[PDB]
């Protein structure tokens, strides 16, 4: 919804959705180094179907 | 009823837990949210003829330091 703009629901040029990796963001870390760079790019297109509708008109 | 302008006309009341903080608290949060009232004082003065009425403390200062449409 109108909250979700700056957070990544983000839409691509192929009409797909940007949702990457949450694994640990801020709190609770101190495991490995590339789980920390485990923060990704990414998505799935199952719940992308109704995702954009949150963001719909404002691309 | 004051001298110049009016009286009462009041606001609501807010009170907040997590009061203070480190200025850079986690956050401030709310509790009260209720309506509130306001009033003032009265003394005896006269103009054009003898009266008593009421006196705005501001206009009390005013009437005291000068006679603008009134005297004591």
């Amino acid at each position: 919804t109108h909250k979700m703009a700056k957070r990544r629901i983000k839409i691509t040029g192929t009409g797909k959705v940007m949702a990457f990796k949450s694994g640990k963001r801020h709190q609770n870390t101190g495991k490995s180094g590339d789980e920390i760079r485990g923060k990704g790019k990414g998505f799935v297109l199952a719940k992308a179907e109704w995702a954009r509708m949150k963001l719909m008109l404002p691309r | 009823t004051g001298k110049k302008n009016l009286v009462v006309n009041s606001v609501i009341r807010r009170g907040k837990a997590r009061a203070d903080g480190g200025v850079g608290r986690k956050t401030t949060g709310i509790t009260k949210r209720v309506q509130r009232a306001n009033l003032h004082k009265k003394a005896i003065r006269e103009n054009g003829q003898v009266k008593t009425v009421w006196l705005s403390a501001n206009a009390l200062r005013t009437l005291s330091k000068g006679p603008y449409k009134g005297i004591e």
Partner: protein, 53 residues
């Protein structure tokens, strides 16, 4: 990764002149005074890291 009154600790990290956070799990049990290791900062890499703080 939970924290409290307990033994060991999670102690923060820094370098000579280089600015980097290792943040590794240390332990006060057998020995902790020197947290000293060799880790690699912003640019030069290749430095000794005193995690004592």
């Amino acid at each position: 990764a939970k924290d409290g009154p307990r033994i060991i600790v999670k102690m923060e990290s820094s370098a000579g002149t280089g600015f980097y956070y290792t943040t590794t799990k240390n332990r006060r049990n057998t020995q902790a005074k020197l947290e000293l290791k060799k880790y690699d900062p912003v640019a030069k890499k290749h430095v000794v890291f005193r995690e004592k703080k």
